[PDB]
Design a protein around this ligand. Structure first.
Ligand SMILES: NC(=O)C1=CN([C@@H]2O[C@H](COP(=O)(O)OP(=O)(O)OC[C@H]3O[C@@H](n4cnc5c(N)ncnc54)[C@H](OP(=O)(O)O)[C@@H]3O)[C@@H](O)[C@H]2O)C=CC1
Ligand SMILES: CCCCCCCCCCCC(=O)SCCNC(=O)CCNC(=O)[C@H](O)C(C)(C)COP(=O)(O)O
Ligand code: SF4
Lengths: 385, 149, 185, 83, 157, 112, 332, 51, 65
């Protein structure tokens, strides 16, 4: 057999994808992904930054799901600090994590459909993507890399009309999902290009470290929001979709259902969001109000110390994982008692998924490798840090 | 005195004391503290040789060394004099002494106490009582010295 | 199921000569074992009925230049059946080869390659132990504490040579390290 | 089988390219590591040069057995592949 | 010069008009700036409306948008892709990472600016740049193209 | 295949050194074809280069250090066998190559 | 003439040398290497260009940031040359043309521009080192019109500035030379390489990086180079036959020569001589059959046995058989 | 050539928290000034590793 | 520019228009540049920049005072 190279430099398939395929005929016998083209040394750069200074690094890890990584980093810091978060801040964090999950699912589904060849749903989905990036651009100052979720509470409060506009969005997102589903689910070409492609058993998913939609497509009912709940996820009602055959079609159906359930969770968070303050009251770990720093001596001292040295985490180490849209996103944070993290490993779900591309694609057509790659929802910002 | 030089890049910002129970004991003088200003003013940076009219022109290291090495061979061995400064370190003084001795001269000395002082026994030019040992003294007799300056 | 139960059960069931340090806390139940008992411990913890740990979350190294055994290798484990997490740690220096666990957990290959790339720890019986993240021909292991943040070499295009070349690093603005540590900590 | 003349020439010629081997001492019976004071690296380098002047291969268990040029030239003369 | 100052001017204006009206960039998506490029070409901003259509291969593209962190392992491929485009070509650097290394400037495996590998014509600042910021960058590139006088300079030499 | 277990004595280290050297020697013809090194370098200058590297790392007496050196050399050889590294890189590394040193250094810069 | 350099670094890209050079005509073949070697030591280079702004684009990569500053000028205008020369302690001249464009004749492009640059350096006192690059065969008696103009520019620049060094290289070989590349293009387009003199003329080709390094070494001298005329030539004295055979070795093509006597090639290159004038000033530039170049291949051009060479600068030229000609594999 | 030393307490503060740790000083003094913006340039990889 | 209301005029001559939206919006805050020579793509002053980008509801004539 001969040796083949797919390096697509154009972001019509990821952009930094490098597959070295060994093809016998039209089948592929092994897929060896060469990673490292987006290894920017993020893990080492964290050790040279303050805990506050290292927060924006997590925005750029999984750049389709920004709030998910910040939530995990903040939860790890709170665990190592034993910092209590107010209820309103928790509700805001859950609301924006579910908005992020919807954004990631839309981008994944339609970028996967465009690789297959369905050009129309891509722009239809990016319209709603623009609508949600508007909500990110309102609360923070950035459309994508919003350093909104922070270890203490949340960065700053919500503007006046955000709840009303999000409700107006949720009034029609159901019909948007319905149209997108009508374009693809019933189509016979879409079924023929996904059914029985990329089948994985539950044992294989567990052995290879699969998580999220990859794991739940094989019949394993494992959701981190229900097994190890965090924030106010245990006060909200939502179902966990589970696959039956493990192929690429079940992954797509579960990705639709998860986005519908995220809409449901968003509605519940909007309805039940209480009033109160958005940060921990321990000003030794959170910034003072701009009116208090300019009027009180101790508030000014706290502001100075926080924005030069930051807070110091007591010497400990822990692993905290959240249910990122891709799967289980974990942060292994080690602290030596100083103002800078001693070690911070980022456990990316895309790493364990791109590692398993070799066995999912074996004895498959060459044209099925793109579908197998697109069903895993891989971005290389997290695959190689 | 033991100091702690703080710098920001290629320049010295400030000088602060450093603990030494036997020499300075957490204090330094004003001259020590505020001498860092002169390290960046009127600094010689290029080898220079006078011209026919009497002006200094910047010259490479090779040519200046060539000029001095050519002139050093035209003078009698006892005509050579080497004088070390007050800020010189021991290694450079040793090298200067060796260089002047090999040329056939023996006139090497320092800026100040170099008028013919006998350094043959090493108790005649040192504080045989340590500075920290002065705390046990009962009577100080300062013979022609002003330690304040 | 819980940290209070797993701790006691593994205290009783596990052979005593394997584990030499057991922490039971809310940050995580850890096990510290010698490098020659790691594979045995993980095989036991993967097959036992009451400790069915079937998911290896990740493998990470930690650098402690002040220790004799410089590197600490951490195995974060997950049990889906009992909804519990277990962490197992070992210690190795720069010139000892620790046993690989790709036989038990097939996903361990890429994290072991990443650990070798980032810290220089070699794994016995690894099907292919080559660098996975650093550039081709990279010299040195970046995640060590003694490795400079910006590295040793720099990359630029050489027009006469008509190729992208590697040169010794020379920063136009050096990294400014700010010392914010307080004496009253 | 091969005649002794050509194999003797081919083993007497290539050995003088080590920038230290004395041309006066090389002969059909001259041990590599013992008689010439060679190193084990040179002891394997001579065997490698034997497969550097031809395409045949020497297994790892056929290189460390006898470091004698007489047995080496006998083995070369008993190499059907060469000519 | 009775008509050269006129005819050469008009033919050069025609050349510049064609080049500004039909730009075919090659998007070199590398990181989160690729999401902003995809948003720019989507329905809201409609990069197609100005005549810009993206191309997969460098054989048919006259522009090249480097948008993402350029690593040491990826720079040879970047240069190889750049060397394959036809002569009237331009490079647009998008985001802080492509401009000067950005947030990974002091990394051991990051090229501190794509301008060390390829000559850059327009720098679009941001992290990530707004889609309208990329529109402004493409408009600035168009403005620069209109400044070219290829036929007049060819005549003058 | 798998990484060999750590050695126990210097004899095993020497045997692995010889095995790696032979593997590199068998790898010489392949490099001459993957890269256009035919009319560039003699087939023995490279052999001398590997011999010189082994000889200048030959003062090591720790079997673990020798095994790590062999492993790194094998990784470098595998990288060179593949088209991963550029052509001038191996030619930049694998080629064999008056008043006073002090005075030249003095003329160059103050930092020796 | 010491005072034109002050090292402030490790001699790398971000290092600083006290050299601020204005390299005229740096958008050509030799400039691409001279500017690269100047920028490697940390010397700021001003690259004055004319016409399109895309010509100096490839030179921005060579410096770190602000080290290379392209500036437009017009050789006809005198204020532009003064403007692009103000901040400069060193001026290097590379302006020259081997063919004739109706706007700029053989004398204009090779002599008048150099004379104007030397003058402008004279009134603008402050350029410590001035370098003018002529051709090895430059002589008043030379039949080739280009060489005579270069020689006249030599006496002009010496008269205008006695301290100006004259680097006088021979035919250059490199990735973008105009001798090996046109030959290979003719071979790949027509199958045979014509020999204008029958492959008998002898000359000394020099690798271009060696010439650039020689200019750099002359800049970083001990002062002996000032007011000298070096003759830069390669190690081996080749001929049009041997170089063509080496090219066929690199191109991997079966040799096929068509010998052409001097008169027939002279008459076949004649049409472009009396067709310089036409409705368009531009005309397809000659590739191998320049009448001036053919006239230049009538007298053997060798480095003088009694003139300065590479070995007087502590340099050794590359052998033009391996690395120097490896660029020809692109046509293989 | 490196220097192994224990940094001492600063004279402007009475706290003794940043004491007892040992550092390796690489004596990395080769720095200059960028002649475009005045930034401090360096060519030494061990510019701040020990700190 | 048909069925639209002119909000105000700029110092550069730029005219700002507004249209009323109901449920989907579109063409409700735009500028008619007073120039046509490529318009430089950035000629909106600071007082009118906020109104155009929906940052503030003040027109820009009111932002001056
Ligand atoms: N084999 C060779 O190449 C040899 C070269 N030399 C000499 O070396 C020098 C440069 O070498 P090379 O670079 O190879 O030759 P090039 O022709 O490649 O250099 C040409 C340069 O001259 C400039 N130039 C030409 N005419 C004018 C003009 N009328 N006004 C302004 N600028 C002008 C060009 O600018 P533009 O491109 O914008 O016109 C270009 O920058 C020349 O003087 C050449 O004679 C010496 C011996 C042999
Ligand atoms: C193109 C090819 C790519 C790869 C080329 C290779 C690149 C890496 C080269 C390897 C680098 C190393 O250090 S790997 C090899 C390093 N290992 C040793 O040096 C072992 C210590 N040496 C000894 O024991 C003896 O001196 C001995 C020399 C054995 C003989 O002498 P004797 O038997 O009498 O005792
Ligand atoms: S500039 Fe910012 S958004 Fe763009 S690739 Fe770099 S980090 Fe990501």
């Amino acid at each position: 057999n001969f040796t083949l190279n797919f390096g697509p430099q154009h972001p019509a398939a990821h952009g930094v994808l490098r597959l070295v395929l060994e093809m016998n005929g039209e089948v592929v016998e092994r897929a060896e992904p060469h990673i490292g083209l987006l290894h920017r040394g993020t893990e080492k750069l964290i050790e040279y930054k303050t805990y506050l200074q290292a927060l924006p690094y997590f925005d750029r890890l999984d750049y389709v799901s920004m709030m998910a990584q910040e939530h995990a980093y903040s939860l790890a810091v709170e665990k190592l600090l034993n910092c209590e978060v107010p209820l309103r801040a928790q509700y805001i964090r859950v609301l924006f994590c579910e908005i992020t999950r919807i954004l990631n699912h839309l981008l994944a589904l339609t970028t996967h459909a465009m690789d297959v060849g369905a050009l129309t749903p891509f722009l239809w989905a990016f319209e709603e993507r623009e609508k949600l990036l508007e909500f990110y651009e309102r609360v923070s100052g950035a459309r994508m890399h919003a350093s909104f979720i922070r270890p203490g509470g949340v960065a700053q409060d919500l503007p006046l009309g955000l709840c009303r506009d999000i409700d107006s969005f949720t009034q029609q997102f159901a019909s948007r999902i319905d149209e997108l589903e009508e374009m693809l689910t019933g189509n016979r070409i879409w079924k023929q290009r996904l059914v029985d492609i990329g089948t994985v058993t539950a044992q294989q998913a567990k052995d290879w470290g699969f998580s999220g939609v990859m794991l739940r497509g094989s019949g394993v009912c494992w959701d981190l929001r229900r097994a190890a709940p965090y924030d106010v996820y245990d006060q909200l009602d939502f179902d966990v979709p589970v696959g039956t055959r493990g192929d690429c079609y079940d992954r797509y159906c579960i990705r639709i259902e998860e986005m519908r359930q995220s809409l449901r969770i968003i509605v519940q968070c909007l309805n039940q969001m209480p009033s109160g303050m958005i940060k921990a009251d321990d000003r030794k770990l959170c910034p003072p109000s701009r009116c208090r720093m300019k009027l009180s001596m101790e508030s000014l001292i706290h502001h100075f110390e926080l924005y030069t040295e930051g807070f110091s985490v007591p010497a400990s180490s822990t692993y905290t994982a959240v249910e990122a849209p891709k799967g289980e996103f974990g942060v292994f944070l080690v602290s030596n008692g100083s103002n800078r993290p001693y070690r911070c490993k980022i456990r990316a779900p895309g790493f364990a998924h791109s590692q398993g591309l070799d066995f999912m694609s074996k004895h498959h057509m060459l044209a099925d490798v793109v579908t197998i790659i697109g069903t895993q929802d891989i971005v290389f910002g997290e695959v190689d840090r | 005195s033991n100091i702690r030089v703080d710098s920001r890049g290629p320049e010295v910002m400030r000088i602060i004391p450093r603990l030494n129970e036997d020499i300075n004991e957490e204090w330094i003088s004003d001259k020590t503290r505020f001498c860092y200003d002169g390290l960046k003013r009127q600094r010689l940076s290029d080898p220079m040789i006078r011209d026919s009219d009497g002006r200094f022109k910047a010259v490479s290291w090779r040519d200046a060394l060539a000029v001095v090495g050519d002139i050093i061979h035209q003078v009698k061995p006892d005509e050579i004099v080497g004088v070390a400064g007050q800020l010189s370190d021991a290694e450079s003084m040793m090298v200067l002494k060796d260089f002047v001795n090999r040329m056939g001269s023996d006139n090497v000395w320092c800026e100040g106490t170099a008028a013919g002082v006998d350094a043959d026994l090493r108790y005649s030019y040192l504080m045989n009582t340590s500075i920290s040992g002065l705390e046990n003294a009962d009577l100080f007799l300062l013979i022609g010295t002003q330690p304040r300056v | 199921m819980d940290n209070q139960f797993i701790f006691k059960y593994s205290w009783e069931t596990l052979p005593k000569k394997w584990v030499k340090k057991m922490e039971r806390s809310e940050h995580g139940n850890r096990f510290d074992t010698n490098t020659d008992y790691l594979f045995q411990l993980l095989c036991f913890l993967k097959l036992h009925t009451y400790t069915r740990v079937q998911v290896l979350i990740d493998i990470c190294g930690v650098d402690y230049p002040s220790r004799k055994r410089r590197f600490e290798v951490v195995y974060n484990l997950l049990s889906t059946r009992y909804n519990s997490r277990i962490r197992v740690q070992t210690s190795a220096d720069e010139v000892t080869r620790i046993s690989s666990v790709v036989s038990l957990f097939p996903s361990a290959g890429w994290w072991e390659r990443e650990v070798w790339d980032m810290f220089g720890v070699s794994f016995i019986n690894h099907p292919d132990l080559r660098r996975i993240l650093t550039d081709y021909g990279f010299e040195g292991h970046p995640l060590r504490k003694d490795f400079p943040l910006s590295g040793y070499v720099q990359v630029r295009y050489d027009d006469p040579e008509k190729r992208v070349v590697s040169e010794p690093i020379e920063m136009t603005q050096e990294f400014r390290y700010f010392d914010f540590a307080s004496p009253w900590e | 089988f091969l005649d002794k003349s050509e194999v003797t020439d081919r083993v007497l010629s290539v050995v003088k390219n080590f920038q230290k081997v004395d041309p006066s001492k090389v002969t059909p019976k001259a041990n590599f590591q013992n008689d010439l004071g060679l190193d084990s690296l040179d002891s394997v380098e001579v065997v490698m040069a034997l497969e550097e002047e031809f395409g045949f291969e020497i297994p790892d268990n056929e290189a460390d057995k006898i470091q004698s040029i007489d047995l080496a030239v006998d083995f070369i003369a008993s190499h059907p592949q060469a000519k | 010069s009775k008509a050269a100052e006129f005819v050469i001017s008009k033919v050069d204006d025609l050349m510049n008009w064609a080049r500004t009206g039909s730009i075919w960039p090659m998007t070199f998506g590398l990181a989160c700036c690729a999401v902003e490029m995809m948003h720019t070409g989507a329905a809201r901003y409609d990069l197609d409306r100005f005549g810009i259509i993206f191309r997969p291969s460098p054989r048919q593209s006259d522009c090249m948008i480097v948008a993402g962190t350029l690593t040491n392992k990826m720079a040879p491929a970047l240069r190889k892709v750049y060397d394959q485009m036809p002569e009237p070509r331009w490079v647009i650097s998008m985001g802080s990472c492509a401009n000067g290394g950005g947030y990974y400037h002091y990394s051991y495996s990051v090229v501190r600016g794509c301008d060390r590998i390829v000559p850059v014509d327009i720098y679009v600042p941001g992290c990530p740049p707004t889609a309208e910021a990329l529109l402004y960058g493409l408009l600035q590139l168009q403005k620069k193209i209109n400044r070219r006088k290829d036929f007049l300079h060819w005549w003058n030499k | 295949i798998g990484v060999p277990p750590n050695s126990a004595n210097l004899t095993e280290a020497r045997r692995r050194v010889f095995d790696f050297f032979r593997a590199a020697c068998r790898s010489i013809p392949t490099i001459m074809d993957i890269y256009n090194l035919q009319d560039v370098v003699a087939p023995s200058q490279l052999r001398y280069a590997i011999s010189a590297q082994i000889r200048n790392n030959a003062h090591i007496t720790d079997p673990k250090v020798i095994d790590l050196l062999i492993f790194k050399g094998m990784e470098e050889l595998t990288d060179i066998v593949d088209h991963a590294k550029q052509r001038h890189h191996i030619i930049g590394q694998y080629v064999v190559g008056g008043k006073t040193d002090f005075l030249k250094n003095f003329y160059t810069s103050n930092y020796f | 003439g010491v005072g034109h350099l002050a090292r402030k670094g490790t001699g790398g890209r971000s290092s600083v040398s006290g050299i601020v050079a204005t390299v005229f005509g740096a958008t050509g073949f030799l400039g691409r290497y001279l500017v690269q070697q100047l920028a490697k030591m940390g010397s700021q280079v001003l690259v004055p260009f004319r016409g399109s702004e895309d010509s100096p684009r490839h030179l921005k990569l060579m410096g770190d940031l602000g080290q290379v500053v392209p500036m437009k000028f017009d050789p006809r205008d005198e204020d532009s040359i003064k403007a692009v020369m103000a901040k400069a302690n060193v001026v290097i001249n590379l302006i020259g043309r081997e063919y004739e464009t109706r706007n700029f004749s053989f004398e204009d492009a090779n002599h008048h521009i150099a004379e104007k640059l030397a003058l402008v350096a004279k009134e603008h006192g402050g350029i410590m080192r001035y370098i003018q690059v002529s051709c090895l065969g430059a002589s008043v008696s030379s039949p080739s019109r280009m060489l005579r103009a270069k020689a006249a520019a030599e006496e002009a620049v010496l008269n205008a500035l006695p301290e100006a060094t004259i680097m006088r290289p021979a035919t250059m070989i490199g990735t973008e030379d105009r001798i090996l590349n046109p030959w290979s293009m003719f071979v790949k387009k027509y199958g045979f390489l014509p020999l204008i003199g029958g492959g008998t003329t002898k000359f000394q080709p020099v690798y271009v990086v060696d010439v650039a390094a020689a200019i750099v070494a002359a800049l970083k001298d001990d002062g002996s180079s000032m007011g000298k005329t070096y003759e830069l030539g390669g190690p081996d004295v080749f001929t049009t036959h041997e170089l063509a055979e080496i090219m066929y070795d690199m191109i991997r093509e079966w040799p096929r020569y068509v010998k052409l006597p001097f008169p027939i090639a002279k008459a076949m290159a004649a049409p472009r001589d009396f067709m310089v004038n036409k409705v368009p000033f531009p005309l397809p530039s000659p590739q191998i059959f320049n009448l001036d170049q053919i006239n230049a291949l009538t007298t053997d051009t060798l480095v003088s046995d009694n003139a300065l060479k590479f070995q007087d600068l502590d340099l050794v030229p590359h052998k033009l058989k391996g690395y120097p000609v490896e660029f020809l594999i692109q046509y293989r | 050539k490196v220097i192994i030393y224990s940094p001492a307490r600063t004279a402007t503060q009475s706290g003794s928290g940043k004491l007892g740790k040992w550092k390796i000083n690489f004596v990395s003094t080769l720095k200059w000034e960028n002649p475009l913006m005045g930034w401090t340039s360096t060519g030494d990889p061990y510019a701040n590793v020990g700190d | 520019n048909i069925g639209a209301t002119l909000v105000g005029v700029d110092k550069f001559g730029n005219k700002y228009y507004q249209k009323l939206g109901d449920t989907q919006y579109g063409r409700h805050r735009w500028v008619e540049y007073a120039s046509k020579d490529r318009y430089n793509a950035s000629q909106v002053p600071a007082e009118w920049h906020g109104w155009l980008h929906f940052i503030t509801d003040h027109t820009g004539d009111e932002l001056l005072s």
